């Protein structure tokens, strides 16, 4: 300590030990000037806190930290963004599914199922852990319109559907069927359902994890689940409530073996054989439990929580002109590239609350009037619209009062610093309204 | 430390190493005496704390830190506020938005239609993410009504709404019109409706947060969003359900191409042409999610979350009176240029509830009954009242029970300090209820 | 200090002092060429962040902490999971319980009724308090099917039930019966509900926590409870209500002493004696809290709250190769056996929400319809369904930006570290989407 | 420092400054052979974390700090509990109270009441602010059926009831009743209704937190409240509605005067005089509220809010084998006198929720049906039940990651330390689920 305190600023006077310089964005002369083509995530800050000087003139002083020995400062910072749920950044806009787009019979007699990728996007926004879901069956439904219907496709056939029910708890052991006529429709986990010939590939999307479905050893780059992915756990057929009701008035068999076919509409149910009691139709949900443990989807996939912020990404704080490079990292002027002084988990978390409007729709819909855009087969015991589950989960932005370590920092803090936010991939971020820094040098050995 | 340590006060005796002093405001024979005319955000406290002397006595006495010691003090500090979630002095209770205030058959033949730009303020109060959004509907009506109307206005022809739903799920793409008659009355993330010649301004006013409406690049003094921005996603028009519907009897074309024109009390949809299935008012939400996005308002915009509190702000502490001036800070008199000692986010942030009265109400104005001074047009599925979201935000305060680090202090601690708490603006804020300072002074240094 | 700072690495120049090094599994190029087969709870990351070697050269280079020192560094962490409430690993989708699987008129004229331990299995899937109880319950019923029935098995005697009311709050000390002829359907506590002959082990599930249901004296290998245990306490009968209120018109005897036999579609509470007022169902709750508490279950047993999370269970970091093995650790490579430098809590709490949904359902099975896959037996007052507590409680995961203390590490940090998390039995755990480090060396003796 | 660190092990290796040891209860080898007989509140752990050795040859084996140095660790633990709401153990489960227990026709013509204290015991569980009340009645009732009625007993005449509603509200200061004829079902607090003769005393009891009525100088042994106490304060009775109302047709007086006195069923009101508005019913928070307050209760007890917890008890650890004994201790084998390192509150907090049964169940007891175990006199305006507060409160058990301060320890550390938590009155907590230790030792000054 003794000679080697002193921190001297143009003759404002000797200033002794810890101290406290401020980087901060809302400073108004700043802006006008400075960072005017900047944002939040990237910004230029005047360091010299001092009324009179213009902030380019300011941009030549310096503070500075004794000579003789080595200085570190303490970081502490206050992070703030409002990143909506999904959007186009973070890949939760995107998602890439195989659908039916063209079905007409052949040249000869026999048929044409002709199938394609498609890529569809949600309007960016923030969503419910549900309404999310929803919004893609809607996005793969809007495709169907615009192609599918005009060339052949009967809703009886569209390909892929995000549900989330057990697709089998009704089912009885011997008459091989979900008994109660109707998949009880309660929610276990978001689901994918799919149909012969058809799948979906979240390669290039983080939607993924909000459907829960994680691949089980995730450092391999690709993420397509196909229906001949999807084996033993092809969803049960309801049985025929009426058929059998309707009997038993007169060797003497029952109605019983009646898997009904269609619904109200007459929507087919493709079941495989005019006699067995599944239907086409595979859930990865079926799959992961019901179907081979060592051989089925339960095996190189895992299920898990939703979550709807898609996964906890963190960011790197930079202060390039203010502190010493760490270990490893080289010196450079390339913004993506930054010495990196401080991580830090990006200001998400996931609020829960209780859902009564669970069943209150069960009882608005036994009661018939309009439809929405997500209900578009109501009579369908398939193509309905997957049951809200009770306690919804919603992506929340909130204030991060972090606090970074101690770090080592150059002697000659120059007038005006840069800071600059960093996501995983190593860009701005868009999403952040404020970035504060306090930094309080103190001595930590000599020279 | 040695002979370094004494901390003397006038004959009351030596005390050895760190203690504590005390800055409070409750201190009851200070106010009635010192601090009358000033308010929470800037007192005065004696700190001397002894039973026996005159405040103005005692602001002669002084502590005294040791002389041969560079001293340095721990400073906690309770804050705690109460600010609303929109007033005039956080700029939440204005907005300048563009409507139209005239309508006459001019001289010719021709017509006229001017407009203007109007400010419209909110009644002061700790609003819903929602309620708000209505406030500023309903401050748009109540301006109609002292001028538009009475002037050839139709409401019929409103220029501004600030909404919440998709105008665009129905939608079918061939028909080129939202099918089921109805935009489906969805929560989707505050927007705003504009008309031809209008649009709205937030240059002054932090509520575009409150909407979640952010300029792509921030340090740009300015806010304007007319009409002539939002191209490329002007709201479809509602399909005819009737002319459908009462059809099918008797090329043989049908009833679909009608697109609705108005609705019961026959208000105008103003389409573009008494072709074109789109209406002329057009959604900031659909365009930057549905028009051109390299040239949209997708471009030099960002869609995000919401936020009641409308920014998380600071505020800065200041303690002139009793401590070393931080680096570059100039030592001064002028209250609104102290120098800081510590930073702090403003006491505000925002629960999240989940709604239940989302649909309760889609089972009441189905069931006629009076109207709020917010549904003044019911019947016309656009100035309607937009859909409460589930999961609304309320601005809530709470005691921040924060903690400075450790800065240096003045040997000789006046018998009388002075607290000041300032903004990112620099001026005292209202709406501190209590501020409460902790020291803990310790040696650093040798002298 | 003086000399024995100096942070060294290839040429890229002198580091003074404390520095960071990071430990992070998002690195692409790492990804890639390294951890391809492990998963987040064990991979590889490369510590030198310099863009310009590749990561198997990087691999080489070192970070040299300086010499002459011996080192210690802060590892600060990050810990980020997303498990579901039940699931084969934390073994909450498993549970063994004795069930009735035969039922026949043995060879002469007596009968013959062999019981039966059988596994069953859940879905795996993240539950409620209540659903978890349900989904047990069925798995029972759909044991039933595939066997019990199809071989004389009424449902009037399976054997065992979880539900989670007081069965005996109507109970009158002197008729001996639950007055009100219908068991007061509140929720208290999670129960079992067993039958002679029959019982449930929990040897090898923590679902037994979730029933909140712990053995007085843990360390003892071994959970059965059956028939023979639950003793005294036996669910008392229903009161015919009836042959009550029917009577009182004509030594002249009232109707009282008549105990309910069956219910509507006849079926038999089984009760003990013609006589008797006590049917032959055994409650645990009534046990525990009526019955003989120094001989009862509630000498051996513990009644305790629920908790969905079956558990806080803790997790061990371990970076064998950059830091010091902990006093008594053994050195290896032997992947679960990796020596631990920090320990915490896996990142799982359970969020309580309050329940409307509890009555909301006592106002929709008295107005008949349908059934769900739970309640199979509606009108039976014991196989019924359990009623809903209010308040749930719903295992949820979080961040959890933990800290483990100052370490002690080699002074020439390897350019590739690895990481793993295990948990208490020693073994990478799935369920982890992030794993961050943050590591801050400092000096701490001399050599 | 210097030679002063040195930790060493058997043969395993120098090691250097501080490190960690650990102290586990799920360790695997050591339950099976140690702590078999033993809980998780008071174990035995290995704390030689060496694959090798069996645990009693671990026993053996020692950490050895080095001599020369006084050393010093710091404790960090975790602790997590699952205690119910009410139980035998906090005293939570009882409760004494004087009731009416005879009711005869004394030898002359004279009449007799006599009565007696007795201890009511709820079935343990976790419960509700609410519920818990709603126990203690029927605990109140139950009793009054195995002994009161049978005995010239009539409910008319039940001494005590837990009720929760200001029995005034509705008075009107000159007719002297209850103008509305019903009193005001709102809830205000636990309250005490009794009646003459009788009363409850919690001189054993944590209940009495519950209710939330505090002895206003509690270090005084002993809580008895009887009805001569609750003196001023009666509830005043119900004015007849109908009498009032079918009159009006013809000095000329009102059929005010007339105050009910019974209700359908005809339950005697007990008003004290034929005259008297006042019914012999006294109120607690009646009393406290509105008699006399320098002579009333509201002299010697204290109003306050509830609490389900009943009362922050808090912990002490003690880690007799491996930490020195701090100050004033002495050192024992006593496990219920072990010294103590560390104090803790018990890991117990109580979330609250709003209640929106409130008012539900006003809206279908006004609808006849049924009756609870807990409103056996509907018709009663006063046996009723206590209208159920809004925002009701639960015991809720949370993991507690504390942190004790940094302890000096001995430097021979063997190799089985012996862990165990204790409660305010000295003895083992049954209701402990996990009990985690984290030791980092360090030099602290030298011999």
Not at 73 to 99: C, Q, S, Y
Not at 212 to 224: D, L, T
Not at 302 to 326: A, F, H, I, K, R
Not at 367 to 374: A, N
């Amino acid at each position: 300590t003794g000679g080697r305190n002193s921190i001297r600023y143009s003759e404002l006077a000797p200033l002794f030990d810890t101290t406290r310089v401020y980087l901060v964005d809302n400073k108004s002369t700043d802006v006008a000037s400075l960072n005017y083509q900047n944002d939040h995530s990237n910004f230029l800050t005047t360091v010299i806190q001092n009324n009179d000087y213009s902030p380019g003139e300011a941009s030549t002083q310096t503070i500075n930290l004794d000579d003789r020995s080595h200085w570190g400062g303490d970081l502490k910072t206050i992070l703030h963004t409002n990143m909506p749920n999904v959007n186009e950044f973070m890949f939760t806009n995107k998602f890439k599914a195989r659908v039916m787009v063209s079905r007409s019979l052949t040249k000869d007699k026999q048929v044409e199922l002709k199938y394609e990728w498609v890529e569809f996007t949600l309007p960016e926004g923030n969503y419910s852990e549900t309404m999310t879901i929803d919004l893609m069956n809607n996005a793969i439904v809007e495709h169907y319109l615009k192609v599918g219907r005009q060339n052949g496709v009967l809703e009886s056939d569209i390909g892929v559907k995000f549900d989330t029910r057990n697709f089998r708890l009704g089912f009885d052991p011997v008459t091989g069927l979900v008994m109660p006529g109707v998949y009880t429709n309660e929610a276990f986990h978001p689901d994918i359902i799919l149909l012969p010939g058809c799948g979906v590939d979240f390669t290039h999307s983080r939607l993924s994890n909000l459907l829960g479905i994680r691949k089980r050893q995730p450092f391999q780059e690709g993420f397509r689940i196909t229906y001949d992915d999807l084996e033993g756990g092809n969803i049960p057929a309801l049985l025929d409530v009426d058929a059998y009701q309707a009997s038993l008035k007169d060797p003497q068999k029952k109605p019983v073996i009646k898997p009904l076919t269609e619904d109200s509409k007459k929507r087919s149910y493709n079941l495989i054989s005019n006699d067995s009691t599944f239907t086409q139709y595979r859930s990865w949900y079926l799959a992961y439990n019901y179907g081979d443990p060592q051989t089925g989807i339960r095996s190189w996939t895992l299920l898990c929580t939703p979550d709807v912020t898609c996964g906890s990404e963190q960011v790197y704080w930079s202060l390039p002109d203010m502190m010493q490079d760490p270990v490893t990292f080289r010196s450079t002027s390339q913004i993506s590239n930054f010495p990196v002084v401080g991580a830090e988990l990006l200001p998400v978390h996931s609020k829960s609350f209780y859902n009564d409007q669970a069943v209150y729709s069960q009882l608005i819909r036994q009661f018939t009037s309009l439809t929405h855009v997500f209900n578009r087969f109501p009579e369908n015991q398939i193509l309905a619209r997957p049951p809200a589950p009770t306690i919804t989960t919603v992506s929340e932005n909130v204030p991060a009062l972090t606090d970074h370590g101690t770090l080592p920092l150059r002697n000659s803090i120059g007038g005006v610093q840069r800071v600059t936010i960093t996501d995983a991939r190593r860009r701005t971020c868009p999403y952040v309204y404020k970035a504060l820094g306090i930094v309080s040098p103190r001595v930590l050995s000599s020279r």
